[PDB]
């Protein structure tokens, strides 16, 4: 039993809700919140910009030190950093950004990072400003993640289509 509330159950391990991940993380304070990151950990817009703003830029400060030490992530890769005031940990995961011409096949690799954590609050990878088809992202999530994932979906209208078309 966990403290997530109001989610629709899609499969044995995937749950979905129309919600603002910033507000959800502040309420639940989950062990792991997933950020829709880029390889440079520049949290400018989308989920990343919103999560970073909610940390008063502490996420960006920590991320800049991470990159200065380690260099950029790989597309499809991840790193674990602090969750600041939002969660215990933040798993920064880089899905492919179609608006940069990146290979959508890397979306499965991106979701594989979730399997290293028993329970996660997460957005749909490569959706929103990353330019992939969200119906595809949900399908890859369900077919790749085996741990317990609570998906927040920003747009109330978007959410209804994913549910109604969910196979
Ligand atoms: O897949 C991630 C999703 C992308 C998306 C945005 C808008 C439309 I229209 C269609 C897709 N963005 C978010 N999901 C959950 N919480 C969020 N907080 C801030 C942004 C955000
Ligand atoms: Cl977005």
From Swiss-Prot:
Subunit structure: May form homohexamers. Interacts with N protein.
Its biological purpose: Responsible for the cleavages located at the N-terminus of the replicase polyprotein. Participates together with nsp4 in the assembly of virally-induced cytoplasmic double-membrane vesicles necessary for viral replication. Antagonizes innate immune induction of type I interferon by blocking the phosphorylation, dimerization and subsequent nuclear translocation of host IRF3. Also prevents host NF-kappa-B signaling. In addition, PL-PRO possesses a deubiquitinating/deISGylating activity and processes both 'Lys-48'- and 'Lys-63'-linked polyubiquitin chains from cellular substrates.
Gene expressing this chain: rep
Domain Macro: 1-167
Shown residues in whole-protein numbering: 1025 to 1191 of 7096
Cell compartment(s), UniProt: Host endoplasmic reticulum membrane
Record-given protein name: Papain-like protease nsp3
Membrane topology, record value: Multi-pass membrane protein
Reactions listed under catalytic activity: Thiol-dependent hydrolysis of ester, thioester, amide, peptide and isopeptide bonds formed by the C-terminal Gly of ubiquitin (a 76-residue protein attached to proteins as an intracellular targeting signal)
Inhibition and activation profile: Inhibited in vitro by GRL-0617.
